[PDB]
Write a protein that binds this ligand. Sequence first.
Ligand SMILES: [Mg+2]
Ligand SMILES: [Mg+2]
Lengths: 135, 64, 113, 43, 189, 51
Amino acid sequence: MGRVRTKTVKKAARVIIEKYYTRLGNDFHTNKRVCEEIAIIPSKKLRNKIAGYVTHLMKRIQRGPVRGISIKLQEEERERRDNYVPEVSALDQEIIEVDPDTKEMLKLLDFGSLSNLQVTQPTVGMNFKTPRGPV
Amino acid sequence: RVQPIKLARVTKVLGRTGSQGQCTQVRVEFMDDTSRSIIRNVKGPVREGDVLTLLESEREARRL
Amino acid sequence: VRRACYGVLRFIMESGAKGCEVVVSGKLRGQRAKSMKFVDGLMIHSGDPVNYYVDTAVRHVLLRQGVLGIKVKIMLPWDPTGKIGPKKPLPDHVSIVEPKDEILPTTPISEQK
Amino acid sequence: DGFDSRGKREFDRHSGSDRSGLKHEDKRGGSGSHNWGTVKDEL
Amino acid sequence: DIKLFGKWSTDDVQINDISLQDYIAVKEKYAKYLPHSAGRYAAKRFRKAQCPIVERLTNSMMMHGRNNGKKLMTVRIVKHAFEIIHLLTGENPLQVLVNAIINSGPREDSTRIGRAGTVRRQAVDVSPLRRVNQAIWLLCTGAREAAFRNIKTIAECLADELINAAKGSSNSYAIKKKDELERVAKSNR
Amino acid sequence: ISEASVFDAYVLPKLYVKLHYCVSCAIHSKVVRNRSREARKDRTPPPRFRP
RNA sequence: CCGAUAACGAACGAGACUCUGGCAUGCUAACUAGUUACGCGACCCCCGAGCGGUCGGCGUCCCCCAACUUCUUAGAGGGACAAGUGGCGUUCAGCCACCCGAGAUUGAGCAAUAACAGGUCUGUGAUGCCCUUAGAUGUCCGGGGCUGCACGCGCGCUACACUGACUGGCUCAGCGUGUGCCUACCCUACGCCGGCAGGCGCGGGUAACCCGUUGAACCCCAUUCGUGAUGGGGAUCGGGGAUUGCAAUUAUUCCCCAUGAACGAGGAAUUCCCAGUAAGUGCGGGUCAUAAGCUUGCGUUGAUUAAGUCCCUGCCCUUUGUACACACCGCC
Ligand SMILES: [Mg+2]
Ligand SMILES: [Mg+2]
C-alpha cells in the first residue's frame, strides 16, 4: 500500500500533459526523458514519479476525457459528438396518442382535428398519489 | 449416531469477526453436495480456495 | 518590542526574502515571562533544504529584569547567481517552460541552404 | 502544606506568588519604554 | 531423487488428506537436500505454505531462549531423529512426519472474549495453515518437554513424539493436547 | 425448536411489547442519540436496513 | 489523494529532501587495495602425471621490469515509477496477485500552529533578585563521606542444565580507536623470563602504510561427566601473587589454590517486538592513571506467530452540553 500520489506530482503531471501533449506519448521511459528538458525537476526520484503519473493519465486520455483538458481534445469531441443522427426522426411518429383534454386545448389553439392525432381513452379511477406516511 | 467428519472448500472470504479480528467469516461449499453452502467462521490465516475439515455441519450463521 | 520587531520584519522583507520569523521571549516589567512571535511570508522548517534556505540567529539581551532571548529565522530568496541567495532550487518546486507555440504544420515544403 | 514529602507541589497551576500567576497580565496594557508594545506601537 | 540428507526419498510420501495436501511441502518441487535455507519465508502472508515442512520443524525446534539461532544444531537433531525413526518403525521418516502433522493438527478450537464458562465461549474450526502451525508447535513442545530432565536425548524424544503421533497412542504430548482442545471445543460448542 | 416440533410446519409466535422510555433511560440505552442542530429537525425514522 | 461541493486558488506540517543499505563483470581510476598471468623457489610428488597440486613463499613502480579493475576503495552517472499483465473499485483515487527484475514499503535525520509554572540557576565569563564575603557558603590542604544496612522498589547480569558443562582440535567478522597546546596519560608487533596475572629489551605506526589477513564469540567436530543442588550455578569467605596510582584499609582492578549459598523455570501482575526483526553471541567507542554487570554502535547465528481489530489501555476527529475562559489543578 502507500502509493497514493501527492499534489506536487499531480499538478505537475496535469500541467505538462496540457502543455506538451503532442510531444509526449504513452511510454514511461520516453516520458521520463521528455520531462528532463520540459521541466527543471530538482530530484530524479520525483521526476520518475511524475513520469509514472503522466503515463497513467495519458493512458486514461487515450480512452476518455478527464478533469485535465486539451483544446484538441475538445475539438475532437465536438467534431465526433454530432453523430448518429438517425435517418428518420424520433419525433415524426405516424400517429400521436393524445388526451381528450389536450385535444380540447388544440381545438382552442385552432390546430385541433389533425390526422396525425389519435385520441385515447381517458384514465379512470384518479388513483394517482402515493399512500400517505409509512404503510 | 455421530455425523461423520466431512470436508468443505472456501469459495469466498466475507470478513473479519470476533471484535479482536481473531476470526474470519467465510463461505464454504461441500464437495459431498456442492449445492449446500453455508457461512462458517474460522481462525487462522485463510485464503480463498483452501479446503478444511468440519466436525459438525450446522452451528450458526450470522450476517455482518 | 512590537515597534522594534515590526521594524525588523519590514527591513527584512524590504531587503527581499521569501519570509522571516522573529521570537522575543522573556520577562519585561513582570515576573511571568511571555514570548511574542512575529512572522511573515513563507517559512520552511523540516528536511534538508532548511539548512541552506533558512538563516538562524539566537541572541541574549541582558536587561535589568533579567534575560530576553531573541530568535531570528530568515528564509532566503532563491538566487541563480547565489551571491545573495541559495543556489539550488526548492526540491519540491517544479517549473515548466511554456512551449513556443510555433507549430506551423502546413503543407510540406523543402528549403534549400 | 502545598508540597508533598519530597517538596514538589501538589497543585502546579495554583500559583504561589501574589505578584503574578499562570497567565501573563500586561502592565499598563504594554505601555512605556521598557515594555511590550501596543496597537499604537504596531501601527 | 532429491535425497534429503543423501537418502530418504520424497516421491514415496503421500499426503492422504486433501485438507492438508496444499500446505504440506514434501513434494518434489519443495524437496530439498537439507532442511536449511534462508528463503525469506516470513516476507508476507501464506509464504510459509510453500516452505518445506522439515524446514518448519527445524525452525520450530529452536526455542526457549538458550538456543534460538542454532540452526545447525537443530538440523543435526532432526537428522538423528529421522534416522532413529527410520530404523525403529521401518518406513520413510518423511511419511512418519507427515502423518504426525496430520494427527497433531487440532481440527477445531474455540475463541471469544466474553465471560467464558470453562475455557472459551464459541467453538470454531481452524484454517489449514493454523493446522500446520499448531501441529508443528505441539510436536516441538512435546519433544522439548520430554527431553528436559531425563537421560533421553532430544533426538530420541522427538523420535518417540513423532512415532506416537503418527498412529495415536494417548501418550504423545501433541495428541493429548489436541484431545483436550477438541474436548473443550466440544463442550463449549 | 423446529426439529423438536411435533407439527409438520409450526409458525413460531411473536412477542409484541410496546416499550415506553423516559429520555434519560432512552439516551442511556442508546435508543436515541444526540444530534446536530440541523439534524434535530428531521422527524424521519432511521432506515430499516432491509436489503 | 479522489470525489461531493459556495467555494477557487494556495501555504506550513506529511510528502518531497539529506544520509545510509540494496544493483550495476557499464565509466574514471589506484605499490597505503589488490586480482589474474608469468618467472624463481619450498614441499607432495616420481607411477610420470608437469599448462599437476599448495604456498598471506619471493617477485614482475626493485619504475622500465606484465596487464586488469572482477574482488577493495570512492566519485560521477544510471536504475524503481504501482512501470507491465490479470482481478476489484464511482471504474476515479487506489487496492490484491503475478511476471520481468538486485530491489515492487531499508533504516534513520529533519520535522508545523501551540501547550506543558515539564527538567535544568550543579554546563557556562547565560542571567535578575536574595544569601554569604575574612573564623568565607571564596579558594587551598589533610582525613572522612558520597558505598554506610532489620527493610521496599526499578533498570539489569548470571544461572537453574545433557538443546548441557569440561577438555582438545578445526574455523569464520564489521563498526571503530590509536603518541596529547594546556596535559603528566597512545595502539602495539617481535624476541626473552614466569604457570598465570605480569616483567625486560627491541622496533613499527600521527595511520587503507603498524597492530591487522583484527586467527572474536556463538557455532562445528572429537573426550569425559550422567538426572544426582550433580563434573549445572559460582554467590559468600580464607590464603597467596601481580598491575596502575602520591595513596588500594571500607577489599580499585587482575591472577592462582581452597568452601560451595540459593536457584529444579518462578504467584498476583507486567515489559518489548513483525525480517536479517526478536533472541542467542561476542567485538569497538564513551567513561578511563586503574576500571564495564551501563550506555552508544558493529558484526555473527538466526527464528515462531500476524498482514487483523477496537475487546483492554490510551490518543485524535466530529456531534453535543457547559454557569469553565488563570479554561475541571475550573467555577461554585
Ligand atoms: Mg519528511
Ligand atoms: Mg574457592
